[PDB]
Design a protein around this ligand. Sequence first.
Ligand SMILES: O=C(O)CCC(=O)C(=O)O
Ligand SMILES: [Fe+2]
Length: 200
Amino acid sequence: LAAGAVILRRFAFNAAEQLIRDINDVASQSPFRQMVTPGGYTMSVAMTNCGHLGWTTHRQGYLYSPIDPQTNKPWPAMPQSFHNLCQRAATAAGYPDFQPDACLINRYAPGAKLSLHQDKDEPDLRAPIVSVSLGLPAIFQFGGLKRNDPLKRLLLEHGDVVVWGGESRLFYHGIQPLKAGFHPLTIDCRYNLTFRQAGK
Ligand SMILES: O=C(O)CCC(=O)C(=O)O
Ligand SMILES: [Fe+2]
């Protein structure tokens, strides 16, 4: 896919049903919610987190917090299925010592999208991003270090795991508006799990 990046297609197929069961479990404690950007806009993607740290938005800036700002309780613990799959994927991608302390769970309803951005809220750039696709297919945009660099368009299907780090750790990327459809395991949406090492 790029220097330090790779797409392990269908890698998470065997663990998908369990992963989805655990997404529902996590959501039972920290419900999916559409966050508001520092600018004041409600995101189309609904999110929640599990693990020690969760990605959140603030009146002015993004940041990680061990506390869910909606429930005001800690985020749920990282499910075992999540931990195991992430580790295997990281190893297969060339990052054997990856130890995530945060997992951002994204839910894409039909038409939802995630505009081009960089995952630049994490201090340690040695840690890669492990991104798991579940359910409906989506078009993933993968660019470069500069906001205006050329973009590659890749279809991400159920079970696909994208991992980027090293030279591509800060590359711009996004998800185009989710096309309508149906999937046996997620029904009407696409879920994505983004594992990161947000702390030290
Ligand atoms: O849904 C995806 O495949 C991308 C999610 C993403 O870029 C993020 O959570 O930072
Ligand atoms: Fe991202």
